[PDB]
Amino acid sequence: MCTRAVYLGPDRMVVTGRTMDWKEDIMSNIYVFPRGMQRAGHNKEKTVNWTSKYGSVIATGYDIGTCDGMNEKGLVASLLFLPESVYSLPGDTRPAMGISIWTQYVLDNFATVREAVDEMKKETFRIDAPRMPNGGPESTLHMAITDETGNTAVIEYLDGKLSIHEGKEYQVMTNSPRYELQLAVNDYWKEVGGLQMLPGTNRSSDRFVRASFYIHAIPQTADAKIAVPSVLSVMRNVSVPFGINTPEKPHISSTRWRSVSDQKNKVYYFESTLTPNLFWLDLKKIDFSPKAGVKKLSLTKGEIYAGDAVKDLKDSQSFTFLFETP
Amino acid sequence: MCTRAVYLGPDRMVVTGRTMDWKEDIMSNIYVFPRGMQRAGHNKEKTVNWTSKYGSVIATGYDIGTCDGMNEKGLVASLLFLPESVYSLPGDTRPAMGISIWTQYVLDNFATVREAVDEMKKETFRIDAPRMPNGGPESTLHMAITDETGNTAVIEYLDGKLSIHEGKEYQVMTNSPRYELQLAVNDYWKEVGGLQMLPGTNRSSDRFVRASFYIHAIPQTADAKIAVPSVLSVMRNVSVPFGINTPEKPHISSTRWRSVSDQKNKVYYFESTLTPNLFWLDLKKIDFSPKAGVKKLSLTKGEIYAGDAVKDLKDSQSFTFLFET
Amino acid sequence: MCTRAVYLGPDRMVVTGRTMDWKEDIMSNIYVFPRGMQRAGHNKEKTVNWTSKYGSVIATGYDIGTCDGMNEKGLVASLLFLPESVYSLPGDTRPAMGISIWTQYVLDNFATVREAVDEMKKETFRIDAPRMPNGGPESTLHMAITDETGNTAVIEYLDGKLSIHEGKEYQVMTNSPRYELQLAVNDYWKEVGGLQMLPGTNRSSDRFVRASFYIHAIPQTADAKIAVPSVLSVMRNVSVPFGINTPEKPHISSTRWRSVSDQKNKVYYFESTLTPNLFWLDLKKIDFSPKAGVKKLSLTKGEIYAGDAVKDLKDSQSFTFLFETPVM
Amino acid sequence: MCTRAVYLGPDRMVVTGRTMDWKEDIMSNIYVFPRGMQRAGHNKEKTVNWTSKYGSVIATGYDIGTCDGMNEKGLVASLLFLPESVYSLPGDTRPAMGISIWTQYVLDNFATVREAVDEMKKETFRIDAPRMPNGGPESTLHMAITDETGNTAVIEYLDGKLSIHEGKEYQVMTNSPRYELQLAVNDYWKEVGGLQMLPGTNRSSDRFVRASFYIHAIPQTADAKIAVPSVLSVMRNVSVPFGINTPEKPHISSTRWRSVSDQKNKVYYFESTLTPNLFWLDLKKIDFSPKAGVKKLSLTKGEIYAGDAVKDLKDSQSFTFLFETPVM
Known part of the structure; x- marks a missing residue:
């Protein structure tokens, strides 16, 4: 499904691009959360609690949980699918955090x-993941975190144990297989040569190698007028065309929107496939004070935004995280 | 370099997407030409002359010639690169139409x-193609024409003799090789299966396979709100990421802009790689009357348009078609 | 189906390898035909006649026709499958040359x-191709010819019209598509790079690419001590493994034997996938005089030969050239 | 370089094929060791000692060590190259086992x-690997062991720690990368489909994927008449053509010989690329008595063997196991 890649340019130029592929309308919205909000990771289970230290600009999924976002300090989180994820084994009595609020945490x-x-290496809590609504898939996902220094951490749970890869060299991430096996698949295709032959299918490992090769070949610049479009360009390359279907594979997940986070200038770009414009939200022009209130930039009913979209931010109440089966 | 793909949806839905891949700034602008204009195929050689029977909205290359556009009746022309093109043999004394005006013709x-x-099959005129300016490649190009019925024609000049492939099934066109050999390369990759494996480099043959496979898999709809972004998503898949370079290969043809021409609703969409928005020009809202005045949609200034850009159309002079160095 | 590759080495070193894949057992046999023989290209239709000017060692298929062989002068002819072959148009009253004996001609x-x-370009005769007996394929094949000079010609019948590709660069031939389109597919993979990526599927275009790349990368030498084992290694690389099948694909054409013709020294090498040995027939030790008698190397009874097999040649009558489809 | 594949057929039919890919001539010879022989795993440092519980038919590499072979009870050990092999860490004081004799042990x-x-999981000894003689490569290799039950074990030394993968499904082994990562590359290509597209180059991962797919696609039969030629089909497909060279790559490791081990009938097949015949050593016809005499099948002098080669075994003395790199 999804695809993520981190560009590391000169003079602390860190730009993270993320692809969102889904078999149906994800109905994603943008929410602006100020700092100082108190939340809980679950409503019916023993849980942890926290007060938000940094405000954020996040994108939801079905308005039931957070899957991608960026805070004030240039830290970007992204929740990407991984069918082979098992967060815990039977009998785990740790405090349970919902899968929907894990990224917001x-x-x-x-x-x-x-x-x-x-x-996160303390493993103080377990991830609780119910089945997604509309009879959709099970919430088997992994996360990548990138700060303004270029360091990236890939978080994934395999048969109940925590698995982490930290380092600036882990810039790309897709879906299956496991992240160590994904690097082995990518290591093989670099021997073939990116200019010679590249796997151009919509498969998980195919988009991983294409994103890994192209993200290192785009110009090495610190100007946002060049870095953001070229990082977006490799996102559309690893994107999958809309409504792709064959008689033998009738329903396939198409790209619904894309996100490009300028972690140096603290700008969060966003583009939907069925909308013509690429808009953005300058976090430097957003008030994240605790008394600012929750603001929402809705995208569900086909609204078209352009340029700086802080103007179109409406006062709203925060969406309710879901931790249950329906 | 460039890639072209034609979408054949239900209820006479014809949409043609095209990419523009160039190593530097192509410096393309958009021009709105009214009907009834008089143009010549050359300025210093014997030629044919004609009065424009239909107005059109076109995109230029360095403002020296036309390489992409659509006219009143939904006919779309696109001039794509083909390094093995030889237009004539030495000793050709036919009238010489310049390569910069061929697409506009x-x-x-x-x-x-x-x-x-x-x-075109009367072969009344030949193509005089000088070299592109400032150490650029020599103007070896083939063209593709698609009308509102879905029929497509591929016109190439090989060994001085004109070759033409016409038919609705010729929906995709790229660079090398010649169109019959390109179809064999696509025939080989269809045996493998698009879902099983697709060639994913920026090569001409590879971009041809991915465009042909995806253009037949996108939804079969007549809604422009679904068909235009779908074929536009296919053109981005066959696009080349911006500024691609390696130590082995210092300069590589990068995608600079894209065009998606809705041939049923007569709407000409356009976006640039470095601009964030996708604007369009609705030909039904454009006055193609014989004396409406030539209008231009400038793009070299780095301007940013959104939605319908007919509001941003300004009076302008017709650009000078170059026929020499 | 079948793969053909021609090695062009220094000092007139011309070595041609060929594979043979089939659904079931081919029942192939090797026949040695001296000079001065008469053959008619058909049994019931109007035909052309000829007397053999050159003797040859040949390999058969089901003992109903010639599909691979080499004459005294170093000329090697190979008949490989081409599904889109159309030999003549309706209403053709030319003399009929049976496909079973076209290669012997x-x-x-x-x-x-x-x-x-x-x-051939005179187009005196047409190719009469009956259906293969007992539910076999349609007799649609094309032929490649190579002389001791190294020149090669690929002869195909497309839509009832004769098509020729002559030149020394035309060293490799497989099955479909036609040779013009087949070179376009091979040109694409040459843009990829043989060492960077090669298509390893047993299909026709992929075997063409590997044969095309490996036949030019083997050592350039005139020593048959090196060239023949190297050409065989190329034909083995492009040969498909034995008895390959999957649940989705129950029957797949599988290589059964290989032949490598040393056109310089007039040596005909041969091996079968099920037999451990690579034997040969040196044509310089064979008597092709008009009344030397027909000889035959039996291969259908599981025979095992080694080294020089001229001593193992047996007196035999020539097989029946099939020109019709037998009633079953 | 080289590749190894294990075939698992019905009725305990286990056949193991192996290639030998080398830059220059490997100078391999075949030795037949009876049981009850005493050897030491090193020459100058602290070592373990043992006496042969089972005799073995092995192939050598420069006759400085054992690289491939099979013993009386159907066990087949194969030592293939692995550049990233690190056998121990600085400061190891365990008994030193020479890499040349590890396969013999x-x-x-x-x-x-x-x-x-x-x-081996006891980790009693450490592997002592000197550089191969005369400017040769570093002796970085791993080994695969397969018994007559069909179970295979891949043993690799990674960052000075022993790594073992045991299981019937571990039937294929090449070189780089690590076996854990190597299976992931093959997992990727299995998604693409062997009949859709196979990587046909000579890379280690590519020959791995083709070997895995074709070793499962050959017919499942207990008949040796079909098994060992079908396993021969695979090892020939994953073999690399002889003397492959390009202007950018003057030296590429080409296949020199291939061995096939019938682990049910205790037969060791062998064929060289420059030799035309596939010969075999029948272990049931070989006497491994404590004093039957160490015998040798010489292959360095262009010898051509055929059929059962137990007749051509000459009494000889065993080679020197190299434990250092000789001074030049």
């Missing part, structure tokens, strides 16, 4: 990948 | 691919 | 490819 | 892989 409390990895 | 005089092919 | 009357192409 | 003392995996 790391954006609310950490300004550095070093900070997120150190706290 | 088709958009000015023909409303049907059947009409364009019948006139 | 080349080895019998021509010493260089120049003589074979000149005679 | 396995074929001498173990009848099943379970016995071998258990004894």
Whole structure:
């Protein structure tokens, strides 16, 4: 489904691009959360609690949970699918955090990948993932976190144990297989040569190698007028065309929207496939004070935004995270 | 370099997407030409002359010639690169139409691919193609024409003799090789299966396979709100990421802009790689009357348009078609 | 189906390898035909006659026709499958040349490819191709011819019209598509790079690419001590493994034997996938005089030969050339 | 370089093929060691000692060490290259086992892989690997062991730590990368489909994928008449053509010989690329008595063997196991 890649340019130029592929309308919206909000990771289970240290600009999925976002300090989180994920084994009595609020937790409390990895390695809580609505798939996903320094951490749960890869070299991430096996698949195709032959299918590993090769070949610049379009360009390359279907594979997940986070200038770009314009939200022009209130930039009913979209931010109440089966 | 793909949806839905891949800034602008204009095929050689039978909205290359456009009747022309093109043999004394005006000639005089092919098969004129300016490649190009019925024609000049492939099934066109050999490369990759494996490099043959496979898999709809972004998503898949370079290969043809021409609703969409928005020009809202005045949609200034850009159309002079160095 | 590759080495070193894949057992046998023989290209229709000017060693298929062989002058003819072959148009009243003996006609009357192409381009006869007996395929095949010079011609019948590709660069031939489109597919993979990526599927275009790339990368030498084992290694790389099948694909054409013709030294090498040995028939030790008698190397009874097999040649009568489809 | 594949057929039919890909001539010879022989795993440092519990038929590499072979009880050990191999860390004081005799140690003392995996998991000794003589490569290799039950064990030394993968499904082994990562690359291509597209280059991962797909696609039969030629089909497909060279790559490792081990009938097949015949050593016709005499099948002098080669075994003395790199 999804595809993520991190560009590391000169003079702290860190730009993260993320693809969102889904078999149906994800109905994603943008929400602007100020700092100082208190939340809980679950409503019916024993849980942890926290007050948000940093405000964030996040994108939801079905308005039931957070899957991608960016906070004030340039830390970007992204929840990408992984069918082979098992968060815990039977009999785990740790405090349960819902899968929907897991991504919002790391954006609310950490300004550095070093900070997120150190706290998550404590394994104080388990991930609770019910089945997605509309009779959709099980919530088997992994996460990547990138700060303004270029460091990236890939978080995934395999048969109940925590697995982490930290380092600036882990810039790309897709879906299956496991992240160590994904690097082995990518290592093979680099021998073939990106200019010679590249796997151009919509498969998970195919988009991983194409994103890994192209993200290192785009110009090495610190100007946002060049970095953001070229990082977006490799996102559309690893994107899958809309409504792709064959008689033998009738329903396939098409790309619904894309996100490009300028972690240096603190700007969050966003584009939907069925809308013509690429808009953005300058976090430097957003008031994240605790008394600012929740603001929402809705995208469900086909609204068309352009340029800077802070003007079109409406006052709203935060969507309710879902932790249950329906 | 460039890639072209034609979508054949239900209820006479014809949408043609095209990419523009160039190593530097192509410096393309958009021009709105009214009907009834008089143009010549050259300025210093014997030629043919004609009065434009249909107005059109076109995109230029360095403002020296036309390489992409659509006219009143939904006929779309696109001039794509083909390094093995030889237009004539030495000693050709036919009238010499410049390569910069060849694309405009088709958009000015023909409303049907059947009409364009019948006139072209008389071979009244030859193509005089000087080299592109400032150390650029030599103007070896082939063209593709698609009308509102879905019929497509591929016109190539090989070994001085004109070759033409016309038919609704010729929906995709790229660069090398010649069109019959390109179809064999696509025939081989269809044996493998698009879902099983697709060649995913920026090569001409590879971009041809991905465009042909995806253009037949996108939804079969007549809604422009679904068909236009779908074929536009296919053109981005066959696009080349911006500024691609390696130590082995210092300069590589990068995608600079895209065009998606809705041939049923007569709408000409356009977006640039470095601009964030996708604007369009609705030809039904454009006055193509013989004395409406030439209008221009400038793009070299780095301007940013959104939605319908007919509001941003300004009075302008027709650009100078170059026929020499 | 079948793959053909021609090695062009220094000092007139011309070595041609060929594979043979089939659904079931081919029942192939090797026949040695001296000179001065008469053959009619058909049994019931109007036909052309000829007397053999050159003797040849040949391999059969089901003992109903010639599909691979080499004559005294170093000319090697190979008949490989081409599904889109259309030999004639309706209403053709030309003399009929049976497809079973079309390959023997080349080895019998021509010493260089120049003589074979000149005679074929006259289009005196048409190819009469009956259906293969007992539910077999349609007799749709094309032929490649190589002389000791190294010149090669690929002869195909497309839509009832004769098509020729002559030249020394035309060293490799497989099955479909036609040779013009087949070179376009091979050109694409040459843009990829043989060492960077090669298509390893047993299909026709992929075997063409590997044969095309590996036949040019083996050592350039005139020593048959090196060239023949190297050409065989190429034909083995492009050969498909034995008895390959999957649940989705129950029956797949599988290589059964390979032949490598040393056109310089007039040596005909041969091996079968089920037999452990690679034997040969040195044509310089064979008597092709008009009344030397027909000889045959039996291969259908599971025979095992080794080294030089001329001593193992047995007196035999020539097989029946099939020109119709037998009633079953 | 080289590749190894294990075939698992019905009725305990286990056949193991192996290629030998080398830059220059490998100078391999075949030795027949009877049981009850005493050897030491090193020459100058602290070492373990053992006496042969089972005799073995092995092939050498420069006759400085054992690289491939099979013992009396059907166990087959194969030492293939692995550049990233690190056998120990600085400061290791365990008994030193020479890499040249490691393969001999396995074929001498173990009848099943379970016995071998258990004894090696003790980590009693360390592998001592000097650089190959005369500017040769560093002796970085791994080994695969397969018994007559069909179970295979891949043993690799990664960052100075022993890594073992045991299981019937581990039937294929090449070189780089690590076996954990190597299976992931093959997992990727299995999604693409063997009949849709196979990587046809000579890369280590590519020959791995083609070997895995074709070793499962050959017919499942207990008949040796079909098994060992079908396993021969695979090892020939994953073999690399002889003397492959390009202007950018002057030296590429080409296949020099291939060995096929019938682990049910205890037969060791062998064929060289420059030799036309596939010969075999029947272990049931070989006497491994404590004093039957160490014998040798010489292959360095262009010898051509055929059929059962137990007749051509000459009494000889065993080669020197190299434990250092000789001074030049």
